[PDB]
Design a protein around this ligand. Sequence first.
Ligand SMILES: [Zn+2]
Ligand SMILES: [Zn+2]
Ligand SMILES: [Zn+2]
Length: 141
Amino acid sequence: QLKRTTMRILIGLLVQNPELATLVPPLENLDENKLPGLGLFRELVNTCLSQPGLTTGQLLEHYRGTNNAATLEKLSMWDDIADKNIAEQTFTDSLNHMFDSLLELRQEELIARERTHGLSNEERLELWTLNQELAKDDIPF
Ligand SMILES: [Zn+2]
Ligand SMILES: [Zn+2]
Ligand SMILES: [Zn+2]
């Protein structure tokens, strides 16, 4: 029994359906320290991309001996996300929620930067754009 979080859904669905890795856009330039679980998700995506067609068991075997192995095993047996008909739509929905959460963090970062350092022209336009858009169980993530 695990409560849903965005990153639990993404990592769990990917572990249970490694073919979903092909729907993930590039994550290489994201700061994993901004979002718990993002670093592990990125690792899993890259593992799937390096070995197309791998099974859940083969993906889990690749992570044996890592500090995330026990967490990946739990998520692999998580029945709450087991339904295959809705797996892809759920993955895509949660992918967009992840990026929305990063946009909120970026907006908060730019507000704090503006009070401490002022913003560049590019940053001020970025913050304005973000403001307009806004106007309109031991798993550690
Ligand atoms: Zn990493
Ligand atoms: Zn590896
Ligand atoms: Zn949603």
